[PDB]
Design a protein around this ligand. Structure first.
Ligand SMILES: OC[C@H]1CNC[C@@H](O)[C@@H]1O
Ligand SMILES: OC[C@H]1CNC[C@@H](O)[C@@H]1O
Lengths: 807, 807
């Protein structure tokens, strides 16, 4: 039927009978009482059965071959739905489609019933998810380790234009993909004290929390490789607190560790630290167990790589030291050599308020042995700084893992650099910034540590799965090899003047837009013109992402329409979506502003259907898979030097949207690949930002010289968008005028003018589409298969493989 | 192979391949890594598959036939293990035995891995479990409704002779028998306030807790009937408490409702009341839902029977009134007529401190509408008392549902009597006591309400399952019909002089004793002589059960041995087991005393192996199934008038033990059935107890006149059994001498002398066994099939059926 595999008579028949088996025996239902949910679950279990044989054989294969194992430690895995992805990677999609059709069911309908696994906040968690997909596809013996949160990222409800948070009870109906492994429960220790004795230190009088693993299969693309994601759940020991009733009820305290994912500004809360240690301690025991079945720890770095995703699992470094020194009785220097060689660290931001700095008094109480080890690491590290740069006393204080001040803190990023053989940023510009500024001192001491690994996205989920129409028209011309080798899309360059292809690309986009326009009316009763330019900015709500700069453009368009109503303008649907962190007042104000503009714009009779402002509620992976293929314009407009990479940008590029963006994060490499003529770049570069900070940013200057901007500010201040509460947006205006760290006004003019260029191109469908083809054609670099191949070869010391395991 | 069904070639082959299917696909295991637990789970799932077809067909059958539905409401269901019971009732035991043997596995070994479902304390909960079995066996459309406690009755550990409690984390490895039904979640309301309006009262500003059902199958004996036990689990709503993190963590508060089973003295704790209302509110919604699919509530009592097991679900009465009056808008008198006709109440004790009396101020806050309804019930009920007995002012205060005093209380038993068309005791003597004393006033007002339903036990679990050896030798002579018609055991009377049978009965007992003797050494490293008389008292530790009277006999034997060491005595193993409630100090002291006697007796060289005292740790259903078939002597020695029925007594009778007991509870009917000559009855009758209370019980009198008793007390006081802590047992001595409500000393002489009679009979194996045959032969009355047949006909108005549903 498509790129979605074969629907063989033997297979369809077999799928139908296993479906019916599961509905009967597994769900305990008859057809007369079954709901669409029961049908979803029956399909899920049928597809799951096809995984297990390969899953068992994969893990047996690693035991025999004993390859180097890669452990990817993250506190976030933003997986989304699993059903379709599993079908795609197993080549079962057409077969299941046929089998369900023959049972009289719509598969697409059943797919919508699946809950997102939302065990992440955004980019970091989605990166981990793409990475797992790519690692299985490239045949690496890799394991994702994290926490099985019982509540993922909150569901966002918009009420009166305000964000409301709702617990994401994703496990309510059960999770068919996971397998509880209560038999492999491990203990994790907290609190206690350190005893020194005849042969070394001993950590005693600890409280024990049990870590229970749950295993989820991670299938590679059509290679019969199925890797494991292991997520730990907190359980109280059976003698815990052991009137009687309270002791039993107080078990909840220990089990709170895995209850909820922390939303995205660093807050030093005890439960977060407990989560961080919990994942690290249980994971390392598992790592070591598996190594001992392979004791000379000299070979440890030959058999084990540990990748620290951000500083969240940074306690892996002193935990590994603790185990090697205190328990295995290795000498400090050998243990340290092993530790540095096995660990690598990925930095994910340059925003200072995101840097993890734990108060010493917290670590003192919770992890007293780990504090001692950290002090010792610091001492020996600073002795090395001192010898390399004698007399440089300020370097010593800058490089210290211990920050003095009001409260003493441990800098977890400094810990990670010292205890890892590799440190990488997530895009070229970001990795350069790391070496030039934030970690300049560390780079000078150990230049060899510092690398770049530009982020990527998986072409399975982010093309084949969410945009089958585009996947198919591409397959027609160049075949199917590109799915696991996205560089082949370059071959599409020879079709940029092909009138048939141009027509098809544009047709697929139109179908996508019509499909999404329908979804909006069906699920949210909101009306949109599907012939308008779909202008979309979807990502977390943050001041650095400048949803506010978008808001200023939108208002400019509205004000230009009201000034010259009978003048022609390219019609646009501007869609903005994303969650604000619960405590982030300003982000919550931006959402209210967006809806408030919509309230005015969407009901102005003069505007007509020429301009529409829609806030996309409850943005998440499943919604991303719907809007991204429908987008014409991708808004990637962070202040230059603030967005480490971005990954949403790459998803839009692959799906036929043109990009308006600053020279920030991966936008730089994206524009470099496609050619700048095929991108809408505007605004300050990093160097212009630095220049502005030196002179001093004065927002008033822009307000004074730009009349169109002045009008918008006065509209906001006077209550134009808030008639009942005239001063509603005083906080926003005040920040823009006096306290704007992200220089919204400084890029306003170039942004508005660049937007005019976008609109002019959209008037010429043929030339828009040819530029689109030029973007899709050069998106190959941004496959996570490329990213992971680079980690494997340049960091982990292993060779990827496209070789299939026997079915 | 036995009474355990056919092992057909077709069936064995099919069981083996489904076993392997489940191990592979369901457990995700290979044979090389599988533990015995995995094998247990693979067998459990294979057997479970055979239930579901019949389960679905049973429930479909009830929907079509629309019979009267029986709802059995209990806060306790003491189910034990399910695997063997399911095999037995499905006739799959020999087939699975063969199939597992051929896979190279020992089924008995796998059976021991299953955790007890310990969702009850003792007799009340086990009664509910036997009742469910019998109701399915008799083809009644019956449902067990309760709470899915995540922690059942605590595991008892004995440490230094002291009881320690350990959380019973029974769900740790999962429960293959249950099916979550998240789709049938119902809301339950707490707190709030009552508004009065134009058309009646309205309960508003409530907090909502969700009730999520879990369904467990209940198979009848070989009739293809599979009924449902539905257990509610508490879930927080998704907007609950909705900084953000705390709101999510505080969800635990609502979910604490179903966290833990309260152990067995009435404590008026809020969480217990919440549990009581939670089960009642969710259950009644389900009851009504199912009735509306059958609105004229006149027919409600024709289609619905609700059995209140004790006063724990007594809130069903005002809850049903609330729904009918406030929501369905029926007039008070019609609603009340419906309520009385649908509800029936079973009383389970005469001990005053066990009676549930809830403080008004608690109900005021938690259930304000229900309080109003209760006051109205009381008012109308007392108007009826006043008219029937004019001027009798003390009757009015005695009969009131509202008790005045320090705190105002609601008497839940008075509520149950007023709102039910039937009230029953659980044995003839108990039901007579109810009418003569505790509820005399109520019986005088409404004599027709009061009935008796003598308890019973299921012959499936308590003969076939736990004593296959005895089941088989019985089947040889009289066939298999007795399993579902236990009255047929009378036919064994014609074998009392049969030398072959006598030999077989005695052989089975010896095998049972040797089997248990081995278990003791294997699992607890304790040594016993299997040729000794197995003297066993197993049940909850309470002063009324008089484990202390047993302790006095044991010490008497020891002291008689030490006085005349070279004199011959019948060797005995005295085994005592049972849990003490966590707050019950005296019960905890009795356990310590038992172990303390063992400490002295078991290591006295002079005693030899003539006397042994063993405390049976962690008594529960699975342990009951092991010790009961091994017992020679059943100790049923409560003070006359305190044990409402007992059910352990009946289990021992069925399994070839002789009974030493008082004329209490069901002992009276047991001795009546077998003939008193075939029982060892001793001690005061109820009337002798009354006589002693009138004169005043003086323990000193017995101490003064009985030298052997004086010696024991002085041994206890001086520290004979506690050399390090001489005064350890001062509390026990003091209670016996001055504060003994249960007249231990008053029965001492007759008990010791009666025990001598037991020992004399044990010296004559042939005559012991002939008396044993006489007991087994007349145990038929005590089948729960008989009990349930009586409820069905005399209370619920339905006819039992032995007719098989199609396979
Ligand atoms: O590296 C993944 C993401 C982490 N947060 C900042 C983003 O720029 C980045 O793409
Ligand atoms: O009715 C079941 C049991 C309840 N508790 C007291 C016992 O005598 C009785 O058998």
């Amino acid at each position: 039927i498509s790129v979605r595999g074969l629907a063989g008579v033997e297979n369809v028949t077999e799928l139908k009978k296993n479906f019916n088996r599961h509905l009967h025996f597994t769900l305990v239902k008859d057809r007369n009482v079954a709901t669409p949910r029961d049908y979803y679950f029956a399909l899920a279990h049928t597809v799951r059965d096809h995984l297990v044989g390969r899953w068992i054989r994969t893990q047996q294969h690693y035991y025999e071959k004993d390859p180097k194992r890669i452990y990817y430690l993250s506190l976030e895995f933003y997986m989304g739905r699993t059903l379709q992805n599993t079908m795609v990677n197993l080549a079962l999609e057409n077969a299941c489609d046929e089998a369900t059709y023959q049972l009289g069911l719509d598969m697409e309908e059943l797919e919508e019933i699946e809950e997102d696994a939302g065990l992440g906040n955004g980019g970091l968690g989605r990166l981990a998810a793409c990475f797992l997909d790519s690692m299985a596809t490239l045949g690496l013996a890799a394991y994702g380790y994290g926490i099985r949160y019982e509540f993922g990222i909150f569901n966002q409800k918009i009420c009166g234009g305000w964000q409301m948070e709702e617990a994401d009870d994703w496990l309510r109906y059960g999770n068919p993909w996971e397998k509880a492994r209560p038999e492999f429960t491990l203990p994790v220790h907290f609190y206690g004290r350190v005893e020194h004795t005849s042969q070394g230190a001993k950590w005693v009088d600890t409280q024990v929390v049990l870590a229970m693993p749950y295993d989820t299969p991670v299938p590679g693309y059509r290679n019969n490789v199925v890797n494991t994601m292991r997520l730990w759940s907190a359980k109280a020991p059976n003698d815990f607190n052991l009137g009687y009733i309270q002791a039993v009820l107080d078990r909840n305290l220990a089990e709170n560790i895995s209850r909820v994912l922390y939303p995205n500004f660093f807050e030093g809360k005890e439960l977060r630290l407990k989560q961080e240690y919990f994942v690290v301690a249980a994971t390392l025991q598992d790592i070591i167990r598996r190594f001992k079945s392979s004791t000379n720890f000299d070979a440890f770095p030959d058999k084990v790589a540990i990748q620290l995703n951000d500083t969240h699992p940074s306690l892996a470094i002193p935990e590994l030291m603790r185990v090697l020194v205190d328990l295995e009785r290795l000498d400090w220097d050998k243990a340290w050599e092993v530790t540095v060689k096995t660990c690598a660290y990925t930095n994910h931001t340059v925003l200072p308020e995101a840097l993890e700095r734990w108060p010493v008094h917290l670590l003192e109480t919770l992890l007293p042995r780990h504090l001692q080890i950290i002090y010792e690491i610091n001492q020996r590290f600073l002795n090395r700084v001192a010898a390399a740069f004698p007399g440089d006393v300020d370097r010593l204080r800058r490089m210290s893992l211990v920050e003095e001040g009001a409260v003493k803190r441990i800098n977890m990023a400094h810990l990670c650099i010292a205890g890892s053989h590799a440190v990488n940023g997530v895009a070229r510009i970001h990795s350069e910034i790391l070496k030039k500024t934030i970690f300049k001192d560390f780079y000078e001491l150990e230049p060899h540590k510092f690398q770049n690994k530009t982020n990527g996205i998986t072409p399975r989920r982010w093309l084949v799965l969410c945009n089958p129409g585009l996947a198919e028209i591409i397959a027609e011309r160049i075949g199917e090899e590109y799915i696991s080798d996205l560089d082949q899309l370059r071959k599409l360059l020879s079709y940029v003047d092909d009138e048939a292809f141009i027509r098809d690309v544009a047709k697929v986009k139109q179908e996508n837009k019509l499909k999404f326009a329908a979804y909006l009316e069906r699920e949210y009763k909101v009306h949109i013109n599907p012939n308008s330019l779909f202008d979309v900015q979807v990502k977390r709500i943050h001041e650095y992402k400048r949803q506010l700069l978008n808001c200023l453009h939108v208002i400019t368009l509205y004000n230009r329409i009201k000034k010259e109503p009978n003048k022609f303008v390219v019609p646009r649907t501007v869609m903005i979506g994303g969650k604000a962190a619960p405590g982030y007042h300003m982000a919550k104000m931006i959402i209210k502003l967006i809806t408030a503009i919509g309230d005015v714009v969407n009901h102005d009779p003069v505007v007509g259907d020429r301009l529409r402002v829609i806030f996309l509620e409850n943005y998440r992976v499943s919604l991303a898979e719907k809007v991204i293929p429908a987008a014409d314009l991708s808004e990637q407009i962070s202040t230059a030097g603030t967005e480490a990479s971005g990954t949403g940008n790459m998803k839009f590029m692959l799906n036929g949207a043109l990009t308006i963006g600053t020279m920030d994060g991966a936008n730089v490499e994206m524009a470099e690949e496609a050619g700048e003529e095929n991108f809408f770049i505007f605004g300050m570069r990093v160097e212009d930002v630095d220049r502005l900070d030196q002179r001093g940013y004065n927002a008033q200057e822009y307000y004074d010289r730009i009349p169109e901007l002045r009008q918008i500010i006065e509209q906001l201040s006077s209550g134009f968008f808030s008639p009942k509460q005239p001063d509603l947006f005083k906080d926003i205006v005040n920040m823009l005028m006096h306290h704007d760290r992200f220089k919204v006004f400084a890029d306003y003019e170039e942004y508005v003018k660049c937007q005019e260029r976008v609109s002019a191109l959209y008037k010429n469908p043929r030339e828009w589409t040819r530029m689109v083809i030029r973007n899709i054609a050069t998106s190959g670099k941004f496959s996570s298969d490329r990213t992971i191949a680079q980690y494997a070869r340049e960091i982990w010391g292993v060779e990827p493989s496209r070789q299939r395991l026997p079915a």
